[PDB]
CSV table of C-alpha atoms and ligand atoms in Angstrom, one decimal:
chain,number,residue,atom,x,y,z
A,3,UNK,CA,0.1,-0.3,0.0
A,4,UNK,CA,1.3,3.8,-0.1
A,5,UNK,CA,0.0,3.9,3.6
A,6,UNK,CA,0.4,2.2,6.8
A,7,UNK,CA,-2.4,3.2,9.1
A,8,UNK,CA,-5.4,3.9,7.7
A,9,UNK,CA,-8.9,4.9,10.1
A,10,UNK,CA,-12.5,3.5,8.2
A,11,UNK,CA,-15.0,5.9,9.6
A,12,UNK,CA,-18.5,4.4,9.9
A,13,UNK,CA,-17.1,0.8,9.9
A,14,UNK,CA,-19.9,-1.2,9.9
A,15,UNK,CA,-21.1,-0.2,6.7
A,16,UNK,CA,-20.9,-2.8,4.0
A,17,UNK,CA,-18.4,-1.4,1.8
A,18,UNK,CA,-16.6,-0.7,5.0
A,19,UNK,CA,-16.7,-4.6,6.4
A,20,UNK,CA,-16.0,-5.5,3.3
A,21,UNK,CA,-12.5,-3.6,3.0
A,22,UNK,CA,-11.4,-4.4,5.9
A,23,UNK,CA,-11.6,-7.7,5.5
A,24,UNK,CA,-9.7,-7.1,1.9
A,25,UNK,CA,-7.1,-5.0,3.5
A,26,UNK,CA,-6.1,-7.3,6.1
A,27,UNK,CA,-5.8,-10.2,4.0
A,28,UNK,CA,-4.0,-8.5,1.2
A,29,UNK,CA,-2.1,-5.8,3.2
A,30,UNK,CA,-0.2,-5.7,6.2
A,31,UNK,CA,-2.5,-1.9,6.7
A,32,UNK,CA,-3.6,-1.3,10.5
A,33,UNK,CA,-6.7,-0.6,10.2
A,34,UNK,CA,-8.6,1.5,13.0
A,35,UNK,CA,-12.3,0.8,13.1
A,36,UNK,CA,-15.1,3.8,13.6
A,37,UNK,CA,-18.9,3.8,14.2
A,38,UNK,CA,-21.8,2.8,15.9
A,39,UNK,CA,-21.6,-0.2,18.7
A,40,UNK,CA,-19.4,-1.9,16.9
A,41,UNK,CA,-18.3,-4.1,19.0
A,42,UNK,CA,-21.1,-5.6,18.9
A,43,UNK,CA,-21.9,-5.7,15.2
A,44,UNK,CA,-18.4,-6.1,13.3
A,45,UNK,CA,-17.7,-9.7,13.7
A,46,UNK,CA,-15.4,-11.3,15.6
A,47,UNK,CA,-11.9,-12.3,13.6
A,48,UNK,CA,-12.4,-9.2,12.9
A,49,UNK,CA,-12.8,-7.2,16.1
A,50,UNK,CA,-9.6,-9.5,17.5
A,51,UNK,CA,-7.0,-9.2,14.2
A,52,UNK,CA,-4.1,-8.0,15.6
A,53,UNK,CA,-4.1,-5.2,13.3
A,54,UNK,CA,-7.5,-3.7,13.6
A,55,UNK,CA,-8.1,-1.2,16.5
A,56,UNK,CA,-12.2,-0.5,17.6
A,57,UNK,CA,-13.4,2.7,18.6
A,58,UNK,CA,-17.3,3.0,19.4
A,59,UNK,CA,-18.6,6.5,17.9
A,60,UNK,CA,-20.6,8.1,15.9
A,61,UNK,CA,-19.9,11.4,13.1
A,62,UNK,CA,-21.0,13.7,15.8
A,63,UNK,CA,-18.5,12.9,18.9
A,64,UNK,CA,-15.5,15.4,18.8
A,65,UNK,CA,-12.9,13.3,21.0
A,66,UNK,CA,-13.9,9.7,20.0
A,67,UNK,CA,-13.8,10.5,16.3
A,68,UNK,CA,-10.2,12.9,16.5
A,69,UNK,CA,-8.8,9.7,18.7
A,70,UNK,CA,-9.9,7.8,15.5
A,71,UNK,CA,-7.5,9.2,12.9
A,72,UNK,CA,-5.0,10.4,15.8
A,73,UNK,CA,-2.5,8.3,14.0
A,74,UNK,CA,-4.0,8.4,10.4
A,75,UNK,CA,-2.3,8.2,7.2
A,76,UNK,CA,-5.5,8.1,5.0
A,77,UNK,CA,-9.4,8.0,6.6
A,78,UNK,CA,-11.8,6.5,4.4
A,79,UNK,CA,-15.4,8.0,5.4
A,80,UNK,CA,-18.0,5.2,4.2
A,81,UNK,CA,-21.0,7.5,4.2
A,82,UNK,CA,-21.5,11.5,2.6
A,83,UNK,CA,-25.4,11.9,3.5
A,84,UNK,CA,-25.0,14.8,5.7
A,85,UNK,CA,-23.3,18.0,5.9
A,86,UNK,CA,-23.0,18.3,9.4
A,87,UNK,CA,-22.1,14.9,9.7
A,88,UNK,CA,-19.4,15.5,7.3
A,89,UNK,CA,-18.5,18.6,8.6
A,90,UNK,CA,-17.9,16.6,12.1
A,91,UNK,CA,-15.7,15.1,10.0
A,92,UNK,CA,-14.0,17.6,8.3
A,93,UNK,CA,-13.4,19.5,11.9
A,94,UNK,CA,-11.6,16.4,13.4
A,95,UNK,CA,-9.5,15.8,10.6
A,96,UNK,CA,-8.3,19.4,10.6
A,97,UNK,CA,-7.6,19.4,15.0
A,98,UNK,CA,-5.2,16.3,14.3
A,99,UNK,CA,-3.8,18.0,10.3
A,100,UNK,CA,-5.1,14.1,8.6
A,101,UNK,CA,-5.1,15.7,5.1
A,102,UNK,CA,-5.9,12.6,3.2
A,103,UNK,CA,-9.6,11.0,2.1
A,104,UNK,CA,-11.2,8.9,0.3
A,105,UNK,CA,-15.5,8.9,0.6
A,106,UNK,CA,-18.2,7.3,-0.9
A,107,UNK,CA,-20.9,9.7,-2.7
A,108,UNK,CA,-23.8,8.8,-5.1
A,109,UNK,CA,-23.4,8.8,-8.7
A,110,UNK,CA,-26.3,11.1,-10.6
A,111,UNK,CA,-26.4,15.1,-8.3
A,112,UNK,CA,-24.7,16.2,-11.8
A,113,UNK,CA,-26.7,15.0,-14.3
A,114,UNK,CA,-24.3,12.6,-15.6
A,115,UNK,CA,-26.6,9.8,-15.9
A,116,UNK,CA,-28.4,9.4,-19.0
A,117,UNK,CA,-32.0,10.3,-19.2
A,118,UNK,CA,-33.6,6.9,-18.3
A,119,UNK,CA,-31.8,5.7,-16.3
A,120,UNK,CA,-31.5,8.9,-14.2
A,121,UNK,CA,-35.2,9.5,-14.1
A,122,UNK,CA,-35.5,6.0,-12.5
A,123,UNK,CA,-32.6,7.3,-9.8
A,124,UNK,CA,-34.6,9.8,-8.6
A,125,UNK,CA,-37.8,7.8,-8.9
A,126,UNK,CA,-36.1,5.4,-6.0
A,127,UNK,CA,-34.8,8.0,-4.2
A,128,UNK,CA,-35.6,10.9,-1.0
A,129,UNK,CA,-34.7,14.5,-2.2
A,130,UNK,CA,-33.8,14.4,1.5
A,131,UNK,CA,-30.8,11.8,0.7
A,132,UNK,CA,-30.0,13.6,-2.5
A,133,UNK,CA,-29.9,16.7,-1.5
A,134,UNK,CA,-28.3,15.3,2.3
A,135,UNK,CA,-25.5,13.6,-0.4
A,136,UNK,CA,-25.2,17.4,-2.4
A,137,UNK,CA,-24.2,18.9,0.6
A,138,UNK,CA,-22.0,16.6,2.5
A,139,UNK,CA,-19.6,16.7,-0.7
A,140,UNK,CA,-19.9,21.0,-0.3
A,141,UNK,CA,-18.6,20.6,2.6
A,142,UNK,CA,-15.5,18.0,1.7
A,143,UNK,CA,-15.1,20.6,-0.6
A,144,UNK,CA,-14.7,23.2,1.0
A,145,UNK,CA,-12.4,22.0,3.5
A,146,UNK,CA,-8.3,21.2,2.9
A,147,UNK,CA,-8.5,17.9,2.5
A,148,UNK,CA,-6.4,15.7,0.0
A,149,UNK,CA,-9.5,13.8,-0.5
A,150,UNK,CA,-11.1,11.9,-3.3
A,151,UNK,CA,-14.2,11.4,-4.2
A,152,UNK,CA,-16.0,7.9,-5.3
A,153,UNK,CA,-19.0,8.7,-7.3
A,154,UNK,CA,-21.2,4.8,-6.8
A,155,UNK,CA,-23.9,3.9,-9.0
A,156,UNK,CA,-26.5,1.6,-7.5
A,157,UNK,CA,-24.9,-1.1,-5.4
A,158,UNK,CA,-25.7,-4.8,-5.3
A,159,UNK,CA,-23.4,-8.0,-4.0
A,160,UNK,CA,-22.1,-10.8,-6.0
A,161,UNK,CA,-18.1,-11.9,-4.9
A,162,UNK,CA,-17.6,-13.2,-8.5
A,163,UNK,CA,-18.4,-9.4,-10.3
A,164,UNK,CA,-15.6,-7.6,-9.3
A,165,UNK,CA,-14.9,-5.9,-12.8
A,166,UNK,CA,-15.2,-2.0,-12.4
A,167,UNK,CA,-14.3,1.2,-14.5
A,168,UNK,CA,-13.7,4.7,-12.8
A,169,UNK,CA,-15.5,7.6,-14.6
A,170,UNK,CA,-13.9,11.1,-15.0
A,171,UNK,CA,-15.7,13.9,-13.5
A,172,UNK,CA,-18.1,15.7,-16.5
A,173,UNK,CA,-18.5,12.3,-18.1
A,174,UNK,CA,-21.9,11.0,-19.4
A,175,UNK,CA,-21.7,8.3,-16.6
A,176,UNK,CA,-23.7,5.4,-18.6
A,177,UNK,CA,-23.4,2.5,-16.1
A,178,UNK,CA,-26.4,1.8,-13.9
A,179,UNK,CA,-25.1,-0.5,-11.6
A,180,UNK,CA,-22.2,-1.9,-9.7
A,181,UNK,CA,-20.6,-4.4,-7.2
A,182,UNK,CA,-19.7,-3.2,-3.3
A,183,UNK,CA,-17.2,-6.2,-3.7
A,184,UNK,CA,-15.7,-4.0,-7.1
A,185,UNK,CA,-15.4,-0.8,-5.4
A,186,UNK,CA,-13.5,-2.3,-2.6
A,187,UNK,CA,-11.3,-3.6,-5.3
A,188,UNK,CA,-10.7,0.4,-6.9
A,189,UNK,CA,-10.5,1.5,-3.2
A,190,UNK,CA,-7.8,-1.1,-3.1
A,191,UNK,CA,-6.3,0.4,-6.3
A,192,UNK,CA,-6.6,3.7,-5.4
A,193,UNK,CA,-4.7,2.8,-2.1
A,194,UNK,CA,-1.7,1.2,-4.1
A,195,UNK,CA,-1.7,4.2,-6.6
A,196,UNK,CA,2.1,5.5,-7.4
A,197,UNK,CA,0.4,8.4,-8.5
A,198,UNK,CA,-1.8,9.7,-6.7
A,199,UNK,CA,-2.4,12.7,-8.9
A,200,UNK,CA,-5.3,11.1,-11.0
A,201,UNK,CA,-7.4,11.1,-7.8
A,202,UNK,CA,-5.7,14.3,-6.1
A,203,UNK,CA,-9.2,16.4,-4.9
A,204,UNK,CA,-11.3,14.6,-7.6
A,205,UNK,CA,-14.6,13.1,-7.7
A,206,UNK,CA,-14.8,9.9,-9.8
A,207,UNK,CA,-17.4,7.8,-10.6
A,208,UNK,CA,-17.1,3.7,-10.6
A,209,UNK,CA,-19.5,1.6,-12.8
A,210,UNK,CA,-19.7,-1.9,-13.7
A,211,UNK,CA,-18.6,-1.9,-17.2
A,212,UNK,CA,-21.0,-3.4,-19.9
A,213,UNK,CA,-24.0,-1.8,-18.4
A,214,UNK,CA,-26.0,0.3,-19.8
A,215,UNK,CA,-29.3,-0.4,-18.4
A,216,UNK,CA,-32.1,2.0,-18.1
A,217,UNK,CA,-32.2,1.0,-14.5
A,218,UNK,CA,-29.5,-1.0,-11.9
A,219,UNK,CA,-31.2,-4.7,-12.5
A,220,UNK,CA,-28.7,-5.6,-8.7
A,221,UNK,CA,-27.9,-8.5,-10.2
B,301,NAP,N1,-27.5,1.8,-1.7
B,301,NAP,C1,-27.1,2.0,-2.8
B,301,NAP,O1,-27.3,1.6,-3.7
B,301,NAP,C2,-26.0,3.0,-2.8
B,301,NAP,C3,-25.1,3.7,-4.5
B,301,NAP,C4,-24.0,5.7,-3.6
B,301,NAP,C5,-24.6,5.4,-2.7
B,301,NAP,N2,-24.3,4.5,-1.7
B,301,NAP,C6,-24.0,5.4,-0.4
B,301,NAP,O2,-22.9,5.4,-0.3
B,301,NAP,C7,-22.6,5.2,1.1
B,301,NAP,C8,-21.7,3.5,0.9
B,301,NAP,O3,-22.4,2.0,0.6
B,301,NAP,P1,-22.7,1.1,2.3
B,301,NAP,O4,-23.9,0.4,1.2
B,301,NAP,O5,-21.5,0.3,2.5
B,301,NAP,O6,-24.1,2.1,2.8
B,301,NAP,P2,-24.1,1.6,4.2
B,301,NAP,O7,-24.3,-0.1,4.6
B,301,NAP,O8,-25.5,2.2,4.8
B,301,NAP,O9,-22.5,2.0,5.2
B,301,NAP,C9,-22.7,3.2,6.0
B,301,NAP,C10,-22.7,3.5,7.0
B,301,NAP,O10,-22.0,5.4,7.2
B,301,NAP,C11,-22.6,4.5,9.2
B,301,NAP,N3,-22.6,5.9,8.9
B,301,NAP,C12,-23.9,7.4,8.3
B,301,NAP,N4,-23.7,8.5,9.6
B,301,NAP,C13,-22.9,7.7,10.4
B,301,NAP,C14,-23.0,9.0,11.9
B,301,NAP,N5,-23.6,10.0,11.5
B,301,NAP,N6,-22.4,8.1,12.7
B,301,NAP,C15,-21.7,7.1,12.6
B,301,NAP,N7,-21.8,6.1,11.4
B,301,NAP,C16,-22.4,6.1,10.3
B,301,NAP,C17,-23.7,3.8,8.7
B,301,NAP,O11,-23.8,3.3,10.3
B,301,NAP,P3,-24.8,2.6,10.6
B,301,NAP,O12,-25.2,1.5,10.3
B,301,NAP,O13,-24.5,2.3,12.7
B,301,NAP,O14,-26.7,3.5,10.9
B,301,NAP,C18,-23.4,2.3,8.3
B,301,NAP,O15,-23.0,1.8,8.4
B,301,NAP,C19,-23.5,5.1,1.3
B,301,NAP,O16,-23.3,6.6,1.7
B,301,NAP,C20,-24.5,4.5,0.7
B,301,NAP,O17,-25.9,4.8,1.3
B,301,NAP,C21,-25.1,4.1,-2.0
B,302,CL,CL1,-14.9,2.8,22.7
């Protein structure tokens, strides 16, 4: 990896948990997991791993967040749903002068989906969720962070489908879906990128190739 110490914020999330297992199996990274009630949620083989540290708390707990990112070289933000939560995280990172962040957001906010997929997508999301995501993004942009935003299309689970393509900012986003396992691979690959340039304060889409559909199929 390009980093040794990573803090995963929102560590019980589906992508976060899969990322955790992948980083334990395939790297020598030291991982700090943060989120609500982790000790009674995260599997025992993860909690008891020598390279795992577990801290319980919410994105609105300044002291605990700061503890969680104290020794981080990179921070993964597992949800970007709330401006207020994003602000709390940015403030904690600022207090410890942590700079490198990878965050996951929803694709489509900027009109990048083609018309039918865009229509289906917004028919299937509350306005409040969408505008929350847009606000979280704005907060991250205002920060001093060397961030990468991953704009994810519709998610599903399939260990056999780990192919992904990155979609540059402003490009038409034609992929209607992507597996969580493929997103984990994309995160793994960015964490191993010798050249961070294309990921430096950029917003990149992640989609499954060949899923040019009018709606996600989730399989
Ligand atoms: N569903 C889709 O198709 C889709 C597509 C694109 C993007 N996304 C979004 O991309 C993100 C990652 O996907 P995912 O499948 O891994 O979602 P996920 O399972 O819901 O994981 C998100 C995690 O963030 C945690 N979290 C959010 N706010 C928090 C707070 N204030 N304090 C502590 N923890 C907090 C949640 O904790 P708790 O479990 O304790 O509530 C949850 O475990 C999510 O934000 C998701 O909504 C979803
Ligand atoms: Cl704790």
